[model samples]
Target chain A: EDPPACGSIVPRREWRALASECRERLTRPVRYVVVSHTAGSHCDTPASCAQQAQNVQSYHVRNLGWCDVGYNFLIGEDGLVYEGRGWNIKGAHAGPTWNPISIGISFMGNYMNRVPPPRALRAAQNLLACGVALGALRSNYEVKGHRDVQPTLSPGDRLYEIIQTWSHYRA
Target chain B: EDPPACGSIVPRREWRALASECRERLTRPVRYVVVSHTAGSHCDTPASCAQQAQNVQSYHVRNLGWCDVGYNFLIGEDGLVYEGRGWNIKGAHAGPTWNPISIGISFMGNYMNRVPPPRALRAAQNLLACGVALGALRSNYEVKGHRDVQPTLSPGDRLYEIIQTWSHYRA
Candidate 1:
């Protein structure tokens, strides 16, 4: 088979990400995608968004002592997808039961009262499409809001509403 | 060995319950208890509370097509406990994962704005104590608020706060 046509994703090196010591591999092609939000500030430019991604990883790594940033990827308002653990590694975004089985992607910034920018949403869709192209996610993957499987107000109200209208969104 | 002392629980027949058609059995000595609320109107007398239990069961059985009422039991503000599925049948109150492994007890009404009365609270505690005595639940069984395990405001703010103070409550 030919190699997957990659999306315009910012790789770890490009974003100046710290080395992730996590070695646990995700079994693919995973069937579920959990969407969430950083629940913090939004970044609209490449320089600022990349720094936000780095800061998120630092908090999870240095402060919380995790193996890496909890999410598999992050979508930014700069119209770029920032790689976190990526799809090949298990994530900590959801709880123990879901962590080993699904890819976790988060949009940078709170979405409770507002929605992410158009480019951010487009980037996320593109990233998921790329995951399918790479055989990292199943073709008929199920998309779930973070709150669907966990007790949280995450992914936020506007984003959660938006995802429900998405073709692949699950109840 | 002596027979376990049963608590003052209102049996299904006494409440004029319709026959439950559920066949799934729960494994005994279950290790968890999930507390939830009906999120409906409260009833403060034996007759009225009994009618509330019947209404809840009708909703779950006839409308939702569930086998019976979703809870193992329901605590009434009348200072009585109403048996739903008892401790042996799998309940529909919680999500699929928690349903099989835990006993689910729900209060008879919404508790978002107000707490359950003292006698109702005592009835729930006594029911749990009786479960332990009957070996239906393990001695070190964990207690989880409905909100703690699932995405909802159930058991509600005041009741959720109260459960947090119980010795067996888990984060």
Candidate 2:
């Protein structure tokens, strides 16, 4: 499939670095990691996505507790993996009750009306695999969009189907 | 013991009626019921407390999505139990992740700084016992004051401790 218009590709190595940090912080083994999209400055510029990612990252860290964003790793439509909340300290993203157990990953784009580019989805797949390899997630860990566990259609219906493909990605 | 200034006993029969109503709506088993006190309203008049209880009850039922008030039942020092949200449906009183599994009960008055009357606590205990008898709770169903769940010191320290002594009412 084609990459969406407003994004670029991130090197898989960037995701690897973020996953390692998450693995070190959480005492409990991380099990589920969600790949999701956020309303970033939607454009082909990874730089803008990077900046939005940074704001969300700090928002989680400062307001939600934990080191940074709650997600283990992030992928922008521009295809860059932004590091978010480190694993193990407890995340504030997946609502209140579920937060204690799951890892949340968000992409920087509003994919409700837009679909993520194939490049962006590919980055997400790589990041999830990295999380599994780092022992941040179980091989059989469930990969879902943000809405699967909660009530709202967050992460968008269009992008969610792409992530649904990750059932095979479950280690 | 005499009732606290803010405490009141709810009639026993209403307990069954409300719980049944909740179960019908949410269609899930309720467990781990926790009673709470708002500890916010300081008004001492009966009319004030009753009206206050009604308002709080509606907030949980209508806005929060519980069948009734988030708490299974509520009592005020005026020795009255204002009907809260119905009992059958899951309540929004507890956080969402915890909602399906836990039944939340709240008192209309702030019982933290000042003591609630005995009538109020006794009524709450009776309602809790009714829940246990209805098979809504396990025999070992433990009770907790709201402060134990979060840092708010909800339901106050003194009232919470006394409730603790009677926690084994069903056990």
Candidate 3:
């Protein structure tokens, strides 16, 4: 069995995630990370974020006919990381070329005009740290803003600005 | 543990495949199968086809940075089905839409002008039978010529024409 769940993370069960319908795998020590945003409303409490996570996955599986929520993890303004596809699966975001090779993590709401609270940003950074510690991401894995790889305004304007300062971000 | 291998199928180890660098899992009872051709020279003898299998995987791994051969399996004129990514893993040749949902099997040579020998066609048929028996494919799985999903002349002219007549094939 996998060792143990990293802390500060909300498991799928805690979030009441529906069973994933169509999932693909990912290899270990993935080389890149793609950051994105939902462009929807934000949630600031544990219960609110969990419900929001459920809503995100429900839309993807029921509405988009996707396997699950499009990210590997979802960060909430409440400062907790809600597991989406988690570390071992490929996600629907990040494009075909990048999707198979990277871990996709998105903020739960629109960050175009507003920046996530430092609490949320720190939670995301901690998630990245956990990925490296769990050996899901390479030690020097590169980070890319969602806009860097796809033709969209994701991870948003203000959020994208902060991402470039992450330790291994490139482009 | 997984059960025994299907008869008439040449396992990857027998042909000396390189360790795959990355791979994605496919959910079982996959609904579609895409048939294609390698567009390379044909190999008729057991030894020759084994070597050809190695070459095909080598190109995909070393040149394209693909984890392994792009087809889930390859059919040889020698009347043996050579496993590529195999039934449990998804292949890359099916294009984004189908790759996550189907198994891809390509013959080892160009089929634009010539049809694969009857023996080669039978090997692929047997492979499909094993897929269902192994519960890797749906019992009523649909079949598509490579060109049917992607805009390429693959599974080529004569091969594409023949695929149209296979059981379960549809426009």
Give the C-alpha miss distance for residue B17 in model 3, angstroms.
Answer: 0.4
Candidate 3 i-RMS: 11.6
The sequence of per-residue lDDT tens digits that candidate 1 reaches over residues A76-144 is 999999989998999887766688899999998988899888888899999989999889999999999
User: Which of candidates 1 and 3 is the stronger one according to DockQ?
Assistant: 1
Q: Give a tens-digit lDDT track for model 3, residues A1-38.
A: 56634678889989899888655789998999999998
After superposing candidate 2 on the true structure, give the runs of residues whose Cα lies further than 4 Å from its correct spot.
Answer: A1-29, A61-67, A169-171, B1-171
Off by over 4 Å in 3: A1-95, A98-171, B1-5
Order of candidate numbers by TM-score, starting with the best? 1, 3, 2
Measured with C-alpha atoms, the lDDT of residue A18 in candidate 1 is 94
TM-score of predicted structure 2:
0.45
Candidate 3: clashing pairs of residues: none
Worst 10 residues of 1 chain A by lDDT: A146-155
Quote the positional error of residue A108 for candidate 3 in Å.
Answer: 44
- State the RMSD for candidate 3: 13.5
List RMSD in Å for every model shown. 6.7, 12.9, 13.5
Residue-level lDDT for A123 in candidate 3: 94
TM-scores for all predictions: 0.57, 0.45, 0.51
Interface RMSD values for the candidates, listed in order? Answer: 8.5, 10.2, 11.6
**lDDT for every model?**
0.88, 0.58, 0.84
